[PDB]
């Protein structure tokens, strides 16, 4: 088969989201998704991807991924990579539909049928999660302090205040809850290390993006004092960035976002390489439903997948965007049934959302 | 003063080019430029930069550069960075106009008044250049072979064929011409090293982008066998990428493109850091006239600027786009006179080009 | 314009201070300053700087800095460098006056309008500072013990005695005060590490110049045991010394003195390079008013400036030496208004001080 | 005994020279010397050294060296260190006179009675030297090219021209002459390595100060390609700088100047440490006669002294400055006879030179 059209879809109600639909002459349409800079990525899909892929065989997935690597903007989570990644997800969906297989099967099989999830006042929240069988939660109580000083400095009173949610969670549920800490890359090295040390009494599970992930060698000093492994990083793109991370000797939980890192194609290879380093992988969600779903496929396949992040009670607009969703039961998530992703865009989404679409085909490129 | 409008300009005749014009309430308009993915970068300028900078003081240059660093797409030459870089150039133009000073002065002064240039059959070309006082030339005769095998392999006969231009240049002008070799990041490590060794008899001046610049530690092995220093890399963005390059112990000629690396703001800091490593800087051109001009300002200021690349006889469409150009005399280039860049977009460019413009202001953001 | 005269000024009441005034044919006079060995540095200004700079264009700042680097005495805080640094400050003052811009603007803009300051019995002092909005203080209670043994040894009873101010401060104000520790490079490595470990219970903010800064690789062992980052070092000169510091992997707070390190010219480049390492900069004061002022300009520009040290109630002789001073309000310091530094030597200082002046011009060199 | 007066002496005919005379209550006067910035160093001797040493026992040499190390300006060849070094030489002269022993004896004995020397058109010069028994010569034919580009670049034709003296020497005397190459720290790293490689066919003996000695880690890359050992460096001061040099793994011939590095006190310790690394020492001369003499004492003592540089036919003004000189016979140099240095300032030097003197004593400090 051959790719005939590239379609992009946006909704005014959720301006960070972009869907990319890859149409074929066989009528198999693949669905992909990415997040942030949706207008910019959309322009890129039509300016750059379309002229390179219309007429091409979508089943040559590794080749198409190679063919879209830019002279500029590679090894990053920039707009070009986000567009390439959404496109790659759509190819995996096509491949699944063409073979009548779920994506997890095409990756190498369902190594597990479900995987533990985690979700993002604190003590009450922890209690509610536990009773629903969720035993990990991620919080980011240092972000407000970071904004005050652009991450250069944290006063001891502000540090003490930011530690209070940890105290409250531990008082409420003790050791029954893993507590992940998100820092959103907002700190410079010295206050990051100061905060890391201060977190010691709370038995934190991971410290995610404690500093900006731009010169990774800085992580060695952080790892020297941190009481929890570094979780890094949804902000990094391509297996080459993850080689660089592994080469630091400081890598911990290997985080990635399939829509920001080069697609399922790069993500699957990052995962198997992390396993070579005896490390786990934890694919990022809480963005769109397609990324959650495709990430869940990856997490069911990769033997070293540790947890699959998800949205609490994702009763949300997710169910209005797509035809089916991954299901969570007793703190475990699994894929919707069926070939490819196991989901399509919801019929007439124009009834619920303010939809805009753009198309490229042989005549427009 | 305050920024009032962001204007982007494209021309159908030169689809890789984008101009960004920053208007102020004082009527001082700054001009910036970048290259590649012009539609994508344009969308980004209006989607992301405009809402963050309308109403802001353009003279807080370092602060505005910081404020535009993305959560994603940083430390790269991707679309976001290219837009940020064009914007930064425009701020330096405003600052120069506001102070009645050329950009080179605002960077720390004219350390030189002009700088040697270089240009990109071979033997005849070399002869012509020399007689015009140009004593360096850059060629890329391995690109055809790279395309054949996606850079995995080069046959010895194809290697021998690609060496012929070097033979012809040396036979023609001997040692009077520096020969730079461009590889456009098209080779994997092993054939890159094979080619490097084979170039030994020709006394090459630098080997530019011999491999992809995505995991820089690979450069240490290349430097171990290369008879010429590594020139790296117009494809890298932000001072953090250049820290990573310097940390390899393999850095040579430090190359950057001001419109791809974070603007004059990042470039000036990359240059002074390269000097700390006893290395030179060589800003990239042959793209648009504004980048050539702003790069020349940087090259006149930075004590470690080695050469400033330029277009042979840039009698080209350059003179139709802008009001003045850098001048080359006896193989040396200098800036056009005046405050800021010393150039503006040519009046009624709509007469020569097919122009499209887009604007953001307080009402549109 | 051209430099016409170099003037040095000393006052008998403050024998460590030296002012350097750079006169021009346009009548714009730049003011610079340095500290320690004022007679020696004065001799150097006239012996070495004057014959090299009379007749030169003062706006070529980077070039003049390069032209004054010595064959001997470079990469240091010695007399030649101190003279060069005072001269460099005066050039920045001229450049500001010529452009009607504050120095902070010429560095790249006011990234902030004010910056937190810090000052140098203990418990009462801490209380007074806090109520004036000052939340950091620096003390050096180990210096007496160091003098006793030339830094080779500290007895446990003497160590316990030197810890008492920390106890008293913490008992008084708890965690509300950052406590910086100054060691004045007075200790050898082993007792420095012993002291560092002993300081752990007091949550110190930084450990400044814990050992002599002459073979920087020794800092790696110190950093391995220190509960606070190393602050280093006002005693180091030129960006090359700071490269060496960064290369140790032990760098923390990057300290410099603009009048000891190569001027604003070297300092600005040191700052941007420290930022590449995710580290902050903290310019040294408590010397003369011009250094305090020029340092404040640097601290308002550099995005990674952490704090700007100042003199408590600098009601001192500072106000008799110069026409205006940086102002402190609620623990934050900012520059005096106006172009360049925003200050000149006070008119007829001969009324308050015992002034000596020496001049060089075209006829004397 | 106790130091009673410090006397400095300059002569208008040789403005780079400074003598320091240390008078004692026993009437034993020690003579020291340094070179460059004579007025500046003189001011320092009286401003800083005098108040610290008048009344002190001159025989506590190691202690006095320690007591003069500055808070600033240490680990350098700056003015303070040059003054300290001249003072230290004078102390060794006093110690020799007090004990009726030559300095070489007080260092640990005459390990040799004489040592090979070297001197600084080329082919004729080489011939003349050989016939006088001198079998090493040092030249600096790249300095002119360095000045043209501030050491950033050398054209291949200029490189070829600078190689001609090597060709001429080798054609004249073949392998009978060691050829040392001096670079005076004038080159950046890349052209330094280019030049080093080009020197391969000429069997050079050492490559002295090929780059600036400010961040020594750069030397590792130079040593990787150089066909001759690095000679480094008369520009470095104190044993701590030489530790840093040795730690690079690139050290070769260890060069020092006793009047620039901390005196005979630092120099003797640098020498024994170089021997621990299996490396030789080569003390710098061609400055003043006292430095030549004291260096010769060091070279007769240190088992790893390789050669002692000297002035060709030093029939020069040397014999008018001092009472006796080291003697060269058949290419070997030895000390003048007698205690201490074996020389004093020539009686009534005021008859031959335009002499200026300054004194400090108990009443002036
Ligand atoms: Na995250
Ligand atoms: Na290139
Ligand atoms: Na200090
Ligand atoms: Na020399």
From TrEMBL, chains A, B, C, D:
User: Which GO MF terms does the UniProt record name?
Assistant: lyase activity
Segments crossing the lipid bilayer = none
What protein is this chain from?
Mandelate racemase / muconate lactonizing enzyme family protein
Q: What PANTHER family is this protein classified in?
A: D-GALACTONATE DEHYDRATASE, D-GALACTONATE DEHYDRATASE-RELATED
Do you know which Pfam families this protein is assigned to?
MR_MLE_C, MR_MLE_N
Q: Note whether Lyase occurs among the keywords.
A: yes
Alphabetically ordered keywords of this record = Lyase
Q: Which CDD domains match?
A: MR_like
Domain Mandelate racemase/muconate lactonizing enzyme C-terminal intervals: 121-229
């Amino acid at each position: 088969m051959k790719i005939t059209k590239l379609e992009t879809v946006r909704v005014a109600e959720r301006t960070n989201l972009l869907w990319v639909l890859v149409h074929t002459d066989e009528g198999i349409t693949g669905l992909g998704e990415t997040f942030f800079g949706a207008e910019t990525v959309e322009t890129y899909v039509h300016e750059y991807i379309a002229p390179r892929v219309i007429g091409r065989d979508p089943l040559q997935i590794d080749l198409l991924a190679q063919d879209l690597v830019g002279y500029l903007g590679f090894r990053s989570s920039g707009a070009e990579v986000r567009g390439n990644s959404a496109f790659d997800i759509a190819l995996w969906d096509i491949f699944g539909k063409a073979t009548n297989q779920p994506i997890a099967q095409l990756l190498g099989g369902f190594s597990r049928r479900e995987i533990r999830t985690y979700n993002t006042r604190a003590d009450e929240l922890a209690h509610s999660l536990l009773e629903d069988g969720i035993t990990a939660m991620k919080i980011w109580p240092f972000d407000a302090a970071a904004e005050k000083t652009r991450g250069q400095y944290i006063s001891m009173p502000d540090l003490k205040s930011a530690l209070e949610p940890f105290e409250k969670i531990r008082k409420a549920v003790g050791d029954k809850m893993d507590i992940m800490v998100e820092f959103h890359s907002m700190w410079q090295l010295l206050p990051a290390m100061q905060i890391a040390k201060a977190l010691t009494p709370y038995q934190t599970f991971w410290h995610e993006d404690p500093i900006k992930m731009d010169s990774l060698s800085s992580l060695t000093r952080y790892a020297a004092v941190s009481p929890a492994p570094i979780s890094a990083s949804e902000t990094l793109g391509s297996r080459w960035a993850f080689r660089d991370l592994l080469e630091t000797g400081a890598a911990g939980v290997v985080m990635l976002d399939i829509s920001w890192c080069g697609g399922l194609s790069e993500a699957r290879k990052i995962a198997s390489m992390a396993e070579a380093w005896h490390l786990p992988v934890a694919p990022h969600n809480c963005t769109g439903p397609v990324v959650l779903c495709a990430s869940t496929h990856l997490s069911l396949n990769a033997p070293n997948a540790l947890v699959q992040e998800s949205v609490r009670a994702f009763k949300t607009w997710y169910r209005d965007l797509v035809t089916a969703l991954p299901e969570v039961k007793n703190g475990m998530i699994t894929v919707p049934p069926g070939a490819g992703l196991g989901m399509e865009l919801h019929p007439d989404i124009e009834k619920t959302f303010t939809v805009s679409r753009r198309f490229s085909d042989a005549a427009s490129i």
